[PDB]
C-alpha cells in the first residue's frame, strides 16, 4: 500500500512543476505567487511524508527479523557448545554452525 | 383477575419478558450475599470460614504424609512442621494460621519449602477471607438502619368537594418517628387510551397535581395529611362521574413519594394506589388529629374510616358547565 501510496503521491508534485513551466508568465501575471507556492509545499509534503513512512517500515522489517535472526545465532551457538562441552561434538560441526 | 400496575402493598408486578441480556456476572454473587438476610449471612460466612479451617488443612496432612512425619518413631529428617502427628491434629495446626492464634505446640521450621508456599498460600487466603467478612458485615449493617419504611396511605380512596370545586383526595400518614426530608410526592393516573390521530396507548402515564400551597411537589409531613387533587379543566378526571367507579374501568391512580428519611440519609420510596372499586364517592376522610391540653395526638386507627358526605352527582364538566350556566 505505502509504495502504491507513495508512487501515487509522486505524480502531482512533478505535474504541478510542469504546469508552472507551462504557464509561467500568466501565473506571475495574476501575481498569485503566494497561492502557487502554497501548493508546492502542499505537494512536497505528500511525497516527503510518504517517503519517511516508506523508509520507516523498510527499516523496521529489517530490524524485527534481524533481532529475531540474531537469537537464531545464540540459540544454535549455545546448543553446539553444549554438544561440544559434553556430547563430544567435533569442532567441524562447531565451525560450520556459526559460519 | 384485573391487572393492577402496582399492588396495594407495593412491589409492582410487571411481566417484563422478552429479555436479551447477560445472564450473570460474579458481581451478582457478591451482591447476592451482601443483600441476604442476617441469619442467612451468619451461616454463609460461617460455612466459608469453616471451609478455610478444613480445605487448607487437607493440604497439611497430605504435606505431612509426604514428608513421612506421620510415621511413628523419631524421623531421620526434621519434619515440615514440628509436632504434627495425625490429620485430626493437623486441623489444630491449620486453625492457628487462618485464625492467627499461634499457640506454639505445633511449630513450623525451615528446610521444608513446600510448607513455605502453603503458609503463604493460606495466609493471603485467610486475610482475604477475613476481608470479605469485614466488608460483608459493613454492608449489611449500614443499609439495615433503613431496611424498612413505615409511611402508609388510606386503603380506600375518597372524593369530595373542597372550596367549591370537587376533588379526589388521599391520606398521607407515616409511622416512623424520624421525619422524611424533602417530600415530593407526585401522583399519576394510568388508563387505556387511543390518540386522536389513532395511536393506541395501553396505559398512558400522566401525573396529577398535588395542589399544595405552592403548587409544587414539595410537602412537609408531621401530621396525618390529606393531599387533595384539584379537578380542573386540564385535569384527566375532568370528565369523571361518581358512577364509573365500577370494577370494570380503565382508571388507575398511583402515587410515588420520593425523598430521604432524615436519620437514614438514603432515599426511600413507597408505591401506593387505589383502583376504581376501592374508591367511595361522596365520603370525607375522618379527622384523625386532636390537640390535647399538652400535646396533639393522631387517631390513626380511623384513617380509613370513610364518612359519607352529600355531594353533587355531576361530573367536573357537568358541574362547572352547570355552575357556568348557573
Amino acid at each position: 500500500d505505502l509504495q502504491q501510496l507513495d508512487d501515487t503521491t509522486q505524480l502531482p508534485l512533478v505535474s504541478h512543476f510542469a504546469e508552472t513551466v507551462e504557464g509561467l508568465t500568466t501565473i506571475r501575471a495574476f501575481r498569485y505567487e503566494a497561492r502557487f507556492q502554497q501548493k508546492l509545499l502542499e505537494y512536497t509534503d505528500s511525497n516527503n511524508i510518504a517517503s519517511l513512512f516508506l523508509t520507516a517500515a523498510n527499516r523496521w522489517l529489517e530490524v524485527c527479523m534481524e533481532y529475531i535472526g540474531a537469537c537464531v545465532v545464540l540459540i544454535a551457538a549455545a546448543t553446539s557448545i553444549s554438544n561440544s562441552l559434553h556430547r563430544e561434538l567435533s569442532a567441524g560441526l562447531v565451525g560450520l554452525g556459526l559460519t | 383477575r384485573r391487572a393492577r400496575f402496582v399492588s396495594k402493598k407495593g412491589n409492582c408486578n410487571v411481566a417484563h419478558k422478552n429479555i436479551r441480556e447477560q445472564g450473570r456476572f460474579l458481581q451478582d454473587v457478591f451482591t447476592t450475599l451482601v443483600d441476604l438476610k442476617w441469619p442467612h449471612t451468619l451461616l454463609i460466612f460461617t460455612m466459608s470460614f469453616l471451609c478455610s479451617w478444613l480445605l487448607f488443612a487437607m493440604v497439611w496432612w497430605l504435606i505431612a504424609f509426604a514428608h513421612g512425619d506421620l510415621a511413628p518413631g523419631e524421623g531421620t529428617n526434621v519434619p515440615c512442621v514440628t509436632s504434627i502427628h495425625s490429620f485430626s491434629s493437623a486441623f489444630l495446626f491449620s486453625i492457628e494460621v487462618q485464625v492467627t492464634i499461634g499457640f506454639g505446640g505445633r511449630m513450623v521450621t525451615e528446610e521444608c519449602p513446600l510448607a513455605i508456599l502453603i503458609l503463604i498460600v493460606q495466609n493471603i487466603v485467610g486475610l482475604m477471607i477475613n476481608a470479605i467478612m469485614l466488608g460483608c458485615i459493613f454492608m449489611k449493617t449500614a443499609q439495615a438502619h433503613r431496611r424498612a419504611e413505615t409511611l402508609i396511605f388510606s386503603k380506600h380512596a375518597v372524593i369530595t368537594l373542597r372550596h367549591g370545586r370537587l376533588c379526589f383526595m388521599l391520606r398521607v400518614g407515616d409511622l416512623r418517628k424520624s421525619m422524611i426530608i424533602s417530600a415530593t410526592i407526585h401522583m399519576q393516573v394510568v388508563r387505556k387510551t387511543t390518540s386522536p390521530e389513532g395511536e393506541v396507548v395501553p396505559l398512558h402515564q400522566v401525573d396529577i397535581p398535588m395542589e399544595n400551597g405552592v403548587g409544587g411537589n414539595s410537602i412537609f409531613l408531621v401530621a396525618p395529611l390529606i393531599i387533595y387533587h384539584v379537578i380542573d379543566s386540564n385535569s384527566p378526571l375532568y370528565d369523571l362521574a361518581p358512577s364509573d367507579l365500577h370494577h370494570h374501568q380503565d382508571l388507575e391512580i398511583i402515587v410515588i413519594l420520593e425523598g430521604v428519611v432524615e436519620t437514614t440519609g438514603i432515599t426511600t420510596q413507597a408505591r401506593t394506589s387505589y383502583l376504581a372499586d376501592e374508591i367511595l364517592w361522596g365520603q370525607r376522610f375522618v379527622p384523625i388529629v386532636a390537640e390535647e391540653d399538652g400535646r396533639y395526638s393522631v387517631d390513626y386507627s380511623k384513617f380509613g374510616n370513610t364518612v359519607k358526605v352529600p355531594t353533587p352527582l355531576c361530573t367536573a364538566r357537568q358541574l362547572d358547565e352547570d355552575r357556568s350556566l348557573l
Binding site: 512543476f17 508546492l40 517517503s51 527499516r59 529489517e62 533481532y67 551457538a77 557448545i81 | -
Partner: protein, 148 residues
C-alpha cells in the same frame, strides 16, 4: 546530521567486524582437548579470575556474541535511517529552492527554447532524486574503505 550517521556507521561495522573474530576464539576453547578449568588464584578464600582467562571461556564468549550481535545490528540499522531521513528533507529544500528560483526566472525564447520544459522537468525529476540517492549512499563512500 550526516556526520553522526557516518559516525554511527563507522562504529557499526567496526563493532561488527569482531563478529568473525569471536568465532576464532570460540573454536579454540573447543580446540583444547583437555579443556580443564583452574583459575589458580584465591586471594581471600574466594577464587578470583584473571582477565586473560575470563575472555577465554567458551560459554562466556557466546554470551558476548549475542550481546554484541544485537548491539551491532541495532546501531547499523539506524545508520541507514538517520541518513535517509536527512536526505528526505534535503529533497524538500532542493525542490523549494528549485521552485523559488523558477518563479523569478526570465521567459526569453532562448530561456524557453534552450531551457525546454522537459529539461526543467528532468532536473526536478532526475537530478534531485539522484542527489537524494547520493546523500542516501554517502556514508558507504566514507565507510566502505574502512571495512575494506
Amino acid at each position: 546530521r550526516l556526520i553522526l550517521s557516518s559516525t554511527f556507521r563507522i562504529l557499526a561495522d567496526l563493532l561488527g567486524f569482531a563478529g568473525p573474530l569471536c568465532i576464532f576464539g570460540i573454536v579454540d576453547h573447543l580446540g583444547k582437548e583437555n579443556h580443564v578449568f583452574q583459575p589458580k588464584t584465591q586471594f581471600l578464600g574466594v577464587y578470583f579470575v584473571s582477565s586473560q582467562e575470563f575472555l577465554g571461556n567458551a560459554y562466556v564468549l557466546a554470551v558476548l556474541l549475542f550481546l554484541a550481535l544485537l548491539l551491532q545490528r541495532t546501531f547499523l540499522q539506524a545508520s541507514y535511517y538517520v541518513a535517509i531521513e536527512t536526505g528526505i528533507n534535503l529533497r524538500g529544500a532542493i525542490q523549494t529552492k528549485i521552485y523559488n528560483k523558477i518563479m523569478h526566472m526570465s521567459t526569453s525564447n532562448l530561456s524557453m527554447g534552450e531551457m525546454t520544459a522537459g529539461q526543467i522537468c528532468n532536473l526536478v525529476a532526475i537530478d534531485t532524486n539522484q542527489l537524494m540517492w547520493f546523500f542516501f549512499l554517502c556514508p558507504n563512500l566514507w565507510t566502505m574503505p574502512v571495512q575494506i
